[PDB]
Ligand SMILES: *[C@@H]1O[C@H](CO)[C@@H](O[C@@H]2O[C@H](CO)[C@@H](O)[C@H](O)[C@H]2NC(C)=O)[C@H](O)[C@H]1NC(C)=O
Ligand SMILES: *[C@@H]1O[C@H](CO)[C@@H](O)[C@H](O)[C@H]1NC(C)=O
């Protein structure tokens with residue numbers, strides 16, 4: 001009934017929600033841009049981030065699990081599903097004054113979902129949690145069997 005979660009290492013994680021699998025990475029680089037890419041204001045805006053209808057519930061579940069407040073928190077950014085390059089849904093957790101409180105909350109959520117998670121975000125620098133759906137070109141090689149066989153799925 002809940003999505004299944006896997007931790008590969010401190011930067012690479014996976015979620016399985018029904019038939020869909022998602023690559024979740026913690027990193028210090030983003031190629032998304034507010035007012036160019038899509039701002040995810042409400043849960044149903046996730047439909048503009050993902051080509052599969054049955055994927056939105058799982059991403060929403062994960063957002064709630066991390067502590068995202070849909071009404072009040074900074075909107076997630078995502079790449080529009082009309083782009084062939086593939087899904088890229090992003091939480092900005094930077095240790096910088098504008099996103100500081102939010103990032104702390106989201107890292108606490110990561111810690112609660114993956115007890116082995118340690119904080120890799122540097123003070124005054126950018127830091128992100130980024131999700132790509134397996135099977136989109138934006139997942140590159142990382143949903144191959146040589147990766148996923150390390151997860152329980
Ligand atoms: C993620 O959040 C960080 C922190 O708010 C953003 O970086 C800041 O952007 C503002 C607005 O342009 C700058 O004035 C600050 O100097 C930046 N701070 C740092 C530490 O870089 C960053 O742009 C956000 N990322 C995305 C993709 O929107
Ligand atoms: C986790 O594994 C990926 C894929 O092999 C690798 O690229 C990445 O650097 C690893 N992360 C850490 C923190 O070792």
Ligand SMILES: *[C@@H]1O[C@H](CO)[C@@H](O)[C@H](O)[C@H]1NC(C)=O
Pocket residue numbers: 037038048080081082
């Ligand atoms: C996504 O891109 C299409 C064009 O490719 C555009 O018509 C649509 O408004 C975009 N959606 C969002 C939410 O920006």
Ligand SMILES: *[C@@H]1O[C@H](CO)[C@@H](O)[C@H](O)[C@H]1NC(C)=O
Pocket residue numbers: 051081082083084085086087136137
């Ligand atoms: C999503 O589907 C639309 C329409 O079929 C297409 O333009 C786009 O390339 C697809 N995106 C991905 C990431 O598969």
